[PDB]
Homo-oligomer: A and B are copies of this chain.
Amino acid sequence: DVRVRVLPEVRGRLGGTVELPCHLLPPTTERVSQVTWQRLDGTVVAAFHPSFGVDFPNSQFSKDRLSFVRARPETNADLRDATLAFRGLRVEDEGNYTCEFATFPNGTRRGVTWLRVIAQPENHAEAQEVTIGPQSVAVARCVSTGGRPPARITWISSLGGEAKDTQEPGIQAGTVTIISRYSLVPVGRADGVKVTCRVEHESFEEPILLPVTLSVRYHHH
A107 touches B47 (CB 8 A): yes
Q: Does A191 contact B (CB under 8 A)?
A: no
Count of chain copies: 2
A102 touches B105 (CB 8 A): no
- Sample 27 A-B pairs with CB under 8 A, ordered by A number: A31-B49, A31-B52, A33-B33, A33-B34, A33-B102, A34-B34, A34-B102, A34-B104, A36-B105, A36-B107, A42-B107, A44-B106, A44-B107, A47-B104, A47-B105, A47-B106, A47-B107, A49-B104, A49-B105, A52-B104, A52-B105, A55-B105, A57-B105, A100-B108, A102-B102, A102-B108, A108-B108
Q: Does A38 contact B (CB under 8 A)?
A: yes
Distance A62 CA – B74 CA, assembled complex (angstroms):
39
Residues of A within 8 A of B (CB): 31, 33-34, 36, 38, 42, 44, 47, 49, 52, 55, 57, 100, 102, 104-108
Secondary structure at the A interface, as helix, strand, loop or mixed, is strand
Report, nearest first, the 10 A-B pairs whose CB atoms are least far apart. Answer: A47-B105, A102-B102, A33-B33, A55-B105, A44-B107, A33-B34, A57-B105, A49-B104, A44-B106, A52-B104
